[PDB]
Write a protein that binds this ligand. Sequence first.
Ligand SMILES: CC(=O)N[C@@H]1[C@@H](O)[C@H](O[C@@H]2O[C@H](CO)[C@@H](O)[C@H](O)[C@H]2NC(C)=O)[C@@H](CO)O[C@H]1O
Length: 199
Amino acid sequence: AVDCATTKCVALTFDDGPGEYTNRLLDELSEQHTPATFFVLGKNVKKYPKTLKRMVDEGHQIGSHTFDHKDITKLTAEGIEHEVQWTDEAIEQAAGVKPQILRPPYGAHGAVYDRLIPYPLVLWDVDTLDWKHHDPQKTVRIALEEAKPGSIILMHDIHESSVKAVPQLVSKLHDAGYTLVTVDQLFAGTDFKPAKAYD
Ligand SMILES: CC(=O)N[C@@H]1[C@@H](O)[C@H](O[C@@H]2O[C@H](CO)[C@@H](O)[C@H](O)[C@H]2NC(C)=O)[C@@H](CO)O[C@H]1O
């Protein structure tokens, strides 16, 4: 519904879910009427079919974070294929959709490896560092002050503070004139290709 070339857009992304906090995170997002992108771990997906179905039905985007969060630069072609495909089949069985984007674990990637990934590689330009400090106030502060039009903000769906940060983060971005979108919406009208990395 929105042209991110026209207006200030941001994509809120969450890695390494789903887990125990995902449904409450989904509650906050719903409450704020805010779509997000979840880069899910293949291995967690199998424990959370309902929750992934919920992501799809409530307008969020699901991307791949590989199966078990391994550094793809150290894997064989076989291992990478497994990382990609097992995660796809997991997501598909659980939610009925296949991911259209992949985020490489630890941001580690390279042309020779990316060639083997059937999706666009999606990185980030804002690292909230929530994985390290687990702190909702600092998560908000970094996201808010570092965000730019077209930014992709990296957060992790692995702890409480992401649930706690969303109301304040969404409120402050909105008030600053930003619209929150999925990665898909963010890249509509821009080139976005398989085996290519974007942040
Ligand atoms: C040297 C380096 O790459 N440092 C940071 C990465 O460790 C970091 O990746 C995140 O590391 C966490 C601890 O192992 C993981 O829990 C987290 O899932 C992993 N991130 C992702 C996207 O897989 C990245 C991203 O935050 O930043 C680097 O600076």
